[PDB]
């Protein structure tokens, strides 16, 4: 059984007095004319907050339970009015399989003919209770409007995901929607507009007025949303040899670092990132956790051994014996520097010698590092691997462990082509790309077209259709009927009239000409 919530579920969002004013606010409110479940002890979800209302003849509903497991595993909130005393507790309660009333604790407090409305929400650990009591003479909730006032604020710090009602009642859910609230001279809320209910409410909220004058007003921007998601990477089955870089028996000295080229592989960076064996994992042009979504043209691993105190020199914008004479990085360096202590691997050891970006000058001037197992940390050897990343600009070759999907043409999709992402419609192009070009760009520097990494075909990317939305209102003094104009879009994309200005829905077309009242554009009023 379900009922129409009408215009109930509004409450005073705060403790601020406002008078003779229309105030726009966004909070967790019951949506107008929402679908609420009608009950005659089920466990219901709490979601982001609960709208609860009951109708009474003889005080059948006594209280509520809010929490997660509700089975003596953690703390839960018990609110019960037993005869005359309201009792609120947040103990680690053991509840019955079907709790009812007859005829470790952190907080404790003790205090159809009628309608009792409630709002139960939990924000930042504070359980907020709002309510309103009013007499009724009524199978459903009565139609009408009032706002609920705050009574209780419980600093409990408890997660609520489910709740149950202890014994008709109705349960709805609150949503983060915008409302225009009408305050009277005495500071109460006498009316409200649900700004996401329909195009007329949008007009009323946009113009900040319950009564709106005759005319055409722009209230929003309409856009076609994606219906699929396309993951496109070349179907490379070769696992990428990062282990051969990091688990190597022998590392080069810093004056003569070993540059290994990584290509034609699936680069799983979760091993390197999650591993606790590393003393540091620092990325400069990328995040260490985004590495599996991206794809690079090449990855270069510079492998070498340095002294602990000089680990800080393996970075952009640095100076020092290594940064200046042995291993220099670009200031605009893109890549990740990964390093770990090798005191139990390399130390004995004087075989590690030291003195433009990525210049490797091994002409022989050199000194050795005295790496001994008994020295201090700053004097212990560290193994450093620098992974230099070449970002997409040309066809990428080294891609993360993403599972590819099929490509859907002539529909709005959320796409990813070798790390290149966006929303749009993929269609066949008439473009001729050169062998080294994966994608092109428009004047806006946005992607114009792309090459599919699995199939050598070029697709154009057309942005998903959108435009301003204007509501044609005769004036709410005469009528609450409106027509909606979607600017510069097709009626197949959005009693429908297609015109040069856009798609007009709800207005009846008439062949007779008339003097213009509310203009649309392009000769149409």
């Amino acid at each position: 059984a379900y009922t129409n919530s009408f215009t109930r579920g509004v409450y005073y969002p705060d403790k601020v007095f406002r008078s003779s004013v229309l105030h726009s606010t966004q909070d967790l409110f019951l949506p107008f004319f929402s679908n609420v479940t009608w009950f005659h002890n089920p466990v219901l979800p709490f979601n982001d907050g609960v709208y609860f209302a009951s109708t009474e003849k003889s005080n059948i509903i006594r209280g509520w339970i809010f929490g997660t497991t509700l089975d003596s595993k953690t703390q839960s909130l018990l609110i019960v009015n037993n005869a005359t005393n309201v009792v609120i507790k947040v103990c680690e309660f053991q509840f019955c399989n079907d709790p009812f009333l007859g005829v470790n604790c952190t907080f404790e407090y003790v205090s159809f003919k009628n309608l009792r409305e409630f709002v139960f929400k939990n924000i930042d650990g504070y359980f907020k209770i709002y309510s309103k009591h009013t007499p009724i003479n009524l199978r459903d909730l009565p139609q009408g409007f009032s706002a609920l006032e705050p009574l209780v604020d419980l600093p409990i710090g408890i997660n609520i995901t489910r709740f149950q009602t202890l014994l008709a009642y109705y349960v709805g859910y609150l949503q983060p929607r915008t409302f225009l609230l009408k305050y009277n001279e005495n500071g109460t809320i006498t009316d409200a507009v649900d700004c996401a209910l329909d195009p007329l409410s949008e007009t009323k909220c946009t113009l900040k007025s319950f009564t709106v004058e005759k005319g055409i007003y722009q209230t929003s921007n309409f856009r076609v949303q994606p219906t699929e998601s396309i993951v496109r990477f070349p179907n490379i089955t070769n696992l990428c040899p990062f282990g051969e870089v990091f688990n190597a028996t022998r590392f080069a000295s810093v004056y003569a670092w070993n540059r290994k080229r990584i290509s034609n592989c699936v680069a799983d960076y979760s091993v390197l990132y999650n591993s606790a064996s590393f003393s540091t994992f620092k990325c400069y042009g990328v995040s260490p956790t985004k590495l599996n979504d991206l794809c690079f043209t090449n990855v270069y691993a510079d492998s070498f051994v340095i002294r602990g105190d000089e680990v800080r020199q393996i970075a952009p914008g640095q100076t020092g014996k290594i940064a200046d004479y042995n291993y220099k990085l670009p200031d605009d360096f893109t890549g990740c520097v990964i390093a770990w202590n090798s005191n139990n691997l390399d130390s004995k050891n004087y075989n590690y010698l030291y003195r433009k970006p990525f210049e490797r000058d091994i002409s022989t001037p050199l000194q050795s590092y005295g790496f001994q197992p008994t020295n201090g940390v700053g004097y212990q050897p560290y193994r450093v691997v620098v992974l230099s990343f070449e970002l997409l600009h040309a066809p990428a070759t080294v891609c993360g462990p993403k599972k590819s999907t099929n490509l859907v043409k002539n529909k709005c999709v959320n796409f990813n082509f070798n790390g290149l992402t966006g929303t749009g419609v993929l269609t066949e192009s008439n473009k001729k790309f050169l062998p080294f070009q994966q994608f092109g760009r428009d004047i806006a520097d946005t992607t114009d077209a792309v090459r599919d990494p699995q199939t050598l075909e070029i697709l154009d990317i057309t942005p998903c259709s959108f435009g301003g939305v204007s509501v044609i209102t005769p004036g709410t003094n005469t009528s609450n009927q409106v027509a909606v104009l979607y600017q510069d879009v097709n009626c197949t994309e959005v009693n429908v009239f297609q015109t040069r200005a856009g798609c007009l829905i709800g207005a009846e077309h008439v062949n007779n000409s008339y003097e213009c009242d509310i203009p649309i554009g392009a000769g149409i009023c």
Partner: antibody
């Protein structure tokens, strides 16, 4: 991860044997195949190592010019061909996944032979 | 390079196994294996002391003298253990039987 090999065979001196190995549970390209011999009553002898990525193969001096190793990445298998067999070659031939040498670069690694097959006996 | 290995102990006793090299080793290229009768060898220790996944077993050493120890022998430890050196080509020792 599991490695499986062919069953036992008996050969006369001068004959050749082709010992197969198949594997699953991991990407084939990243690990090489190590062949290890163990004659009855003896310890382990390294025979060779082959890259499943580029075909590069290293051999123990004792078998150079006698054994040819190859791989086929489309079936996730490797093969060891032993030519001109002697009675001295009676042994169990083990196929093991090998992470002591890089499949892509050929360099020595810090590791070992973790997952071994059952061993193919050749008389 | 040549490796030489050098056990009668009851369950519950501590075991020490050792191997010597004719030449020094990088250490990180030392591995130990365990071979049960009727079964293929498995990797126990790699990198001189690091424990292989799925493996009381510990390795250590330097230069030309390395060991493998078992803190307490179990009935399942009665296998032949091997010392492997792989920094310069690959070689194994004869193997040590534990009873």
């Amino acid at each position: 991860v599991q490695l499986v090999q062919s069953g036992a065979e008996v050969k006369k001196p001068g004959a050749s044997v082709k010992v197969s190995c198949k594997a699953s549970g991991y990407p084939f390209t990243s690990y090489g195949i190590s062949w290890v011999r163990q004659a009855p009553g003896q310890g382990l002898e390294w025979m060779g190592w082959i890259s499943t990525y580029n075909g590069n193969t290293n051999y123990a001096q004792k078998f150079q010019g006698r054994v040819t190793m190859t791989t086929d990445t489309s079936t996730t298998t490797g093969y060891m061909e032993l030519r001109r067999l002697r009675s001295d070659d009676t042994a169990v031939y083990y196929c093991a996944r090998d992470y002591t040498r890089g499949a892509w670069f050929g360099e020595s690694l810090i590791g070992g032979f973790d997952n071994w097959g059952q061993g193919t006996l050749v008389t | 390079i040549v490796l030489t290995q050098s056990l009668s102990l009851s369950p519950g006793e501590r075991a020490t196994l050792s191997c010597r090299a004719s030449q020094t080793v990088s250490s990180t290229s030392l591995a130990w294996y365990q071979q049960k009768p009727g079964q293929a060898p498995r990797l126990l220790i790699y990198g001189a002391s690091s424990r292989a996944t799925g493996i009381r077993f510990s390795g250590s050493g330097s230069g030309t003298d390395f060991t493998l120890t078992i803190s307490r022998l179990e009935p399942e430890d009665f296998a032949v253990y091997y010392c492997q050196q792989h920094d310069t080509s690959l070689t194994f020792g004869g193997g040590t039987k534990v009873e």
